[PDB]
């Protein structure tokens, strides 16, 4: 079972949190967005395209639980994991924690090339917030820690934690 689940929107940080969590703990980092590539053969891309978000929706909770399952280090699950109740089920019991950004700096952070089908532009500002205001709390629900990655820079952020994953 994974030392530590991170949740959060597309932008929050799960990605580099995760890597320097996985580092700092001694472990490896499995992404569930990676994991359904590599079991599909097919990007998540073409998933959405081709066969929809509802068909997305099962393989990813079908993965989420597999992982949870069978991976022992840092898991980071795809920002709308937490949509899914079978997901929200499956992480009763472990650590979660929960990536928290503004709306502002989550919109600066995602405005790149990667392909993202639910946060495209024009409108992706209005699109991050509606994402938000959905999944907060969902994020909240399933949380056993809520740390802030606004401003906060990654190092102080892991800093923080490690030392929340040791203490009462
Ligand atoms: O917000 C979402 O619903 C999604 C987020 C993505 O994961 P990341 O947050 O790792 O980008 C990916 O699973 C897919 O595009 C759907």
Redesign the pocket.
Known sequence: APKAVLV?????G??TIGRRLAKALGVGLL???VA?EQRTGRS??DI?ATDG?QE?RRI?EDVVRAALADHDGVL??????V?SPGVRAALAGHTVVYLEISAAEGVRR?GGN??????AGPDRAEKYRA?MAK?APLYRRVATMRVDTNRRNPGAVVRHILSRLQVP
């Not at 980071?76 to 994991?81: Q, V, W």
């Not at 990667?114 to 946060?119: A, F």
């Open positions: 959060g929107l597309p932008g929050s799960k990605s992404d569930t967005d359904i998540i891309a959405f978000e997305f990813e980071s699950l795809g920002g709308g994991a949509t995602t990667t392909v993202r089908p639910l946060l994402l999944r």
